Amino acid sequence: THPDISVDVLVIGAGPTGLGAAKRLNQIDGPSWMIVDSNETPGGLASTDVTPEGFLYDVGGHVIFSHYKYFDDCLDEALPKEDDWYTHQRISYVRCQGQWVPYPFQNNISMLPKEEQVKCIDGMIDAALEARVANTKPKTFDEWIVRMMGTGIADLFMRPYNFKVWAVPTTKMQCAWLGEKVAAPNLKAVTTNVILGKTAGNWGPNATFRFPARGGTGGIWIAVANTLPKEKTRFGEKGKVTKVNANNKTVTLQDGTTIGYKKLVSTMAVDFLAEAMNDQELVGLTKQLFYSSTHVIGVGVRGSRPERIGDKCWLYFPEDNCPFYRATIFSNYSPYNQPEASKKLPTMQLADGSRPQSTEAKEGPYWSIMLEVSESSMKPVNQETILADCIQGLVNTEMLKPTDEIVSTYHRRFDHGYPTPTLEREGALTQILPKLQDKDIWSRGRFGSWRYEVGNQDHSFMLGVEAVDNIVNGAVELTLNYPDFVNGRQNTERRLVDGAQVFAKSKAQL
Amino acid sequence: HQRISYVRCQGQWVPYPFQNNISMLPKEEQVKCIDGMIDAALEARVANTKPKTFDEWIVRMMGTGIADLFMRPYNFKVWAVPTTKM
Ligand SMILES: Cc1cc2c(cc1C)N(C[C@H](O)[C@H](O)[C@H](O)COP(=O)(O)OP(=O)(O)OC[C@H]1O[C@@H](n3cnc4c(N)ncnc43)[C@H](O)[C@@H]1O)c1[nH]c(=O)[nH]c(=O)c1N2
Ligand SMILES: O=c1ccn([C@@H]2O[C@H](COP(=O)(O)OP(=O)(O)O)[C@@H](O)[C@H]2O)c(=O)[nH]1
Ligand SMILES: O=c1ccn([C@@H]2O[C@H](COP(=O)(O)OP(=O)(O)O)[C@@H](O)[C@H]2O)c(=O)[nH]1
């Protein structure tokens, strides 16, 4: 029997990856296509929730810094107005020994206690000498750390923090993933700073960035989705894929609709895809991948932004006096992420956990904090007490004063948080992805292709754009297979308007 | 007597031996000195030959920093010959 619908290229999922695919498919305007999503609102893990009190929370707080001009082009098309964006400078610190060490930590030893400083430089010297002679390569993420920073920093920050976020020991992870993620410290630069007491916080793709004025990052992906022809979309319960028949190239949707395809671009989690295919081999294969779940906690507090907080952006917490690994002053990103000062809200509780002095609706202004906590079979979290442990954690780290007035809470558990860069990961992926490609299925995205190196909105979006370009023009998928390549260059060649469109336009005016 | 010996540099009294007391120098000078020691230490880890001149020895063991700030000028001032000739 024939499918209810037939198209050349079918995109599953409307997060950044999928929309990337849809944008390029829309630009080329050649083969027929369709994008579906089980959610009425596109954006996936890049979406935004709002509390009953009017606070916005990303999925951990998201940040736009682009390696691609194509990515930029599409954002400027969705949000063309100027007052649609704010530009920020990256103010990032690490919490250590009661200090706010400027990021990257390994580059600002100066702020630590003198006692600790000595232990870090000692380690760094032992490594710089051993690295002067090394000929082999690091096997684990742990070996990589010890070699690039020394034991001083490893025990002080790297080891404890990484477990805290990955929910697995540094010894169980690979190291080919950390190109532009972890800074390798230069002895000359580290000591120079310790001597001058200066700071080095320019490092990284994060230095400067922009944030959407309204709707958080979620509003971006809504704006983008609006540029696509509606007739080619299915968002909501009518767009969930419940079965994938790779053998006869059909997909079955939640309401029973079937779609035939020639090429399939899938952005759903590859472990879910295996299930929906009912393929025993792929299931056993995907079950060798590892992932951590992420608890996002949102806290809205009353008052004008404290001076202790200032223009800070996101913070790191390697110490065990709080459950979360990262915190974001989400209210500094936009004046529309929290209620306006005039809005009246009762105090739900004080930061220390006790009842407020007054429960009457008072005015603002307000600010917001967003926290992330990791969870895995190696690092369990109690779902009934986590919110309380975070708030307390906030006090322990001098983020909030015990007497601070909390006006709103938020808590959500995302089962698939991070795709874990385990030692076994590439062993499994190098099987799965080619096996899926041989069925004409491009599985791409954070959990589509499972590579954290290149998980991230701009990267994921591009993974999509490239999967289409590979399917239609034979383009090599650079972002997928060569993360270091795309990350250390300016990717300017592909644009939202290429020659193919320019020529086709003049040929019509001709 | 105990040896109380300093080197006069940049209007400071740097305790002898100079190359062990970079602490007392101005911060800007300290930077040049440590950078040299690091580049020198990193080459020392790998050397298998022996220095020819006195100058090659000073660069290998203290770096360009200390070499240019103290050693080179001083050693001429006392030996009345360039380090390169010793
Ligand atoms: C905690 C944390 C923090 C960060 C970020 C994420 C996370 C979780 N990100 C990365 C980012 O969120 C990510 O790259 C994109 O969301 C990935 O897009 P995907 O489409 O691949 O996945 P994602 O999961 O987001 O989207 C896929 C979609 O597919 C749909 N779907 C699933 N199954 C389906 C089915 N069966 N049928 C139909 N639809 C289905 C989902 O409903 C959804 O709409 C990020 N990015 C950034 O650049 N800055 C940052 O700060 C960070 N940091
Ligand atoms: O001060 C720091 C903080 C971060 N990291 C490393 O950077 C990685 C990713 O940090 P980032 O916040 O950029 O990752 P994200 O979760 O936002 O994708 C972490 O796993 C750490 O190993 C680091 O080297 N120094
Ligand atoms: O702070 C110092 C002082 C001395 N010198 C070196 O030590 C050598 C001998 O100095 P010393 O005063 O011991 O010589 P003396 O004149 O007493 O025999 C000199 O040539 C310098 O090269 C040095 O390395 N650092």
A196: Cα within 13 Å, side-chain hemisphere: 16
- Encode A485-506: b = buried (16+ Cβ within 10 Å), e = exposed: ebbeeebeebebeeeeeeeeee
User: Residue whose CA is closest, atom 6 of ligand 2?
Assistant: A182
User: Residue whose CA is closest, atom 18 of ligand 3?
Assistant: B78
Ligand 2 atom closest to the CA of A103, numbered from 1: 1
Residues A301 and A377 sit within 8 Å (Cβ to Cβ): no
Residues B59 and B30 sit within 8 Å (Cβ to Cβ): no
Residues in contact with ligand 1 by the CB-under-6-Å rule are A 12-18, 36-39, 44-46, 59-60, 62-63, 239-241, 267-268, 294, 372, 417, 445-448, 455-458, 460
Q: Considering just the CA atoms, what is the radius of gyration of chain B in Å?
A: 14
Question: In this structure, is residue A66 part of a structural domain?
Answer: yes
Domains in chain A, number = 1
Best CA proximity match to A221, nearest among A442, A336, A83, A59: A59
CA distance A122 to chain B (A): 13
d(C-alpha B65, C-alpha A358), whole Å:
65
CA distance A342 to chain B (A): 51
Residues A282 and A418 sit within 8 Å (Cβ to Cβ): no
Residues A276 and A24 sit within 8 Å (Cβ to Cβ): no
What SS3 string covers A167-218? CCCHHHECCCCCCCCCCCCCHHHHHHHHHHCCCCCCCCCCCEEEEECCCHHH
Q: Which residues contact A259 (CB under 8 A, 6 or more apart)?
A: A3, A4, A5, A6, A7, A10, A34, A36, A250, A251, A252, A253
User: Which H or E run includes A100?
Assistant: strand A99-102
Number of Cβ pairs closer than 8 Å across A and B?
28
**Count of H helices and E strands in chain B?**
3, 2
CA of A295 relative to ligand 2 center, distance in Å: 17
Residues B23 and B43 sit within 8 Å (Cβ to Cβ): no
A345 to each of A119, A367, A405, A408, how far by Cα in Å? Answer: 49, 13, 11, 9
- Looking at residue A362, what DSSP letter applies? B
Question: In this structure, is residue A55 part of a structural domain?
Answer: yes
Residues A326 and A60 sit within 8 Å (Cβ to Cβ): yes
Residues A366 and A276 sit within 8 Å (Cβ to Cβ): no
Please check whether residue A195 touches B, CB under 8 A.
Answer: yes
Best CA proximity match to A331, nearest among A289, A290, A303: A303
Estimate to the nearest angstrom the gap between the alpha carbon of A291 and the chain centroid: 14
Best CA proximity match to A406, nearest among A359, A340, A439, A337: A359
CA of A59 relative to ligand 2 center, distance in Å: 17
Residues A326 and A206 sit within 8 Å (Cβ to Cβ): no
Of A129, A133, A195, the CB nearest to B34: A195
- A307: burial class by Cβ within 10 Å (0-12, 13-18, 19+)? exposed
d(C-alpha A488, C-alpha B61), whole Å:
36
Residues A51 and A410 sit within 8 Å (Cβ to Cβ): yes
d(C-alpha A248, C-alpha A136), whole Å:
48
CA distance A195 to chain B (A): 6
Collapsing DSSP states into helix, strand and coil, what is residue B49? Answer: coil
Residue A349's domain is classified under what CATH number?
Answer: 3.50.50.60
CA of A356 relative to ligand 1 center, distance in Å: 38
Please check whether residue A114 touches B, CB under 8 A.
Answer: no
Backbone φ and ψ of A169, nearest 5°: -60, 145
Angle of the A114-130 helix axis to the A187-196 helix axis, nearest 10: 160
A34 to each of A11, A312, A364, how far by Cα in Å? Answer: 6, 42, 46
Q: Which residues pair with A253 in a beta bridge?
A: A241
A135 to each of A120, A368, B42, B48, how far by Cα in Å? Answer: 24, 49, 15, 18
d(C-alpha A65, C-alpha A62), whole Å:
10
Peptide-bond breaks in chain A following residues (C–N over 2.5 A): none
Q: Which two tokens stand for residue A155?
A: 């025990």
Question: In this structure, is residue A2 part of a structural domain?
Answer: no
Best CA proximity match to A246, nearest among A89, A75, A443, A482: A443
CA of A394 relative to ligand 1 center, distance in Å: 27
d(C-alpha A21, C-alpha A24), whole Å:
6
Question: In this structure, is residue A338 part of a structural domain?
Answer: yes
Of A133, A187, A196, the CB nearest to B38: A187
What SS3 string covers A71-94? HHHHHHHHCCCHHHEEEEECCEEE
Letter for the amino acid at A213?
A: A
Q: Which residue's structure tokens are 């874990």?
A: A420
B71 is in an annotated binding site: yes
Residues in contact with ligand 3 by the CB-under-6-Å rule are B 7, 16-18, 75, 78
Question: In this structure, is residue A3 part of a structural domain?
Answer: no
Instruction: Using alpha carbons only, give the angle A64, A65, A66 rounded to the nearest 5 degrees.
Output: 115
With beta carbons under 8 A apart, name residues in chain B contacting A195: 27, 30-31, 34
A130: Cα within 13 Å, side-chain hemisphere: 18
Angle of the A114-130 helix axis to the B27-44 helix axis, nearest 10: 40
Collapsing DSSP states into helix, strand and coil, what is residue A21? Answer: helix
CA distance B16 to chain A (A): 20
Please check whether residue A132 touches B, CB under 8 A.
Answer: yes
d(C-alpha A120, C-alpha A105), whole Å:
11
**Do the bridges between strand A291-302 and strand A405-419 make them parallel or antiparallel, or are there none, so unpaired?**
antiparallel
Q: Give the ligand at the shortest distance from the Cα of B83.
A: 3
Residues A455 and A464 sit within 8 Å (Cβ to Cβ): no
With beta carbons under 8 A apart, name residues in chain B contacting A129: 41-42, 45
| C-alpha torsion angle, residues A205, A124, B9, B3 (rounded to 10) | 170
User: Which H or E run includes A458?
Assistant: helix A457-472
Range of the domain at A42: 8-510
Q: Which two tokens stand for residue A13?
A: 């999922």
Of B30, B42, B46, the CB nearest to A195: B30
d(C-alpha A166, C-alpha A187), whole Å:
28
Q: Which residues contact A461 (CB under 8 A, 6 or more apart)?
A: A16, A17, A19, A20, A23, A68, A71, A74
Letter for the amino acid at A45?
A: L
d(C-alpha A312, C-alpha A103), whole Å:
11
User: Which H or E run includes A121?
Assistant: helix A114-130
d(C-alpha A97, C-alpha A157), whole Å:
11
d(C-alpha A79, C-alpha A445), whole Å:
23
Question: In this structure, is residue A264 part of a structural domain?
Answer: yes
d(C-alpha A510, C-alpha B19), whole Å:
79
d(C-alpha A469, C-alpha A21), whole Å:
9
Angle of the A69-78 helix axis to the A457-472 helix axis, nearest 10: 110
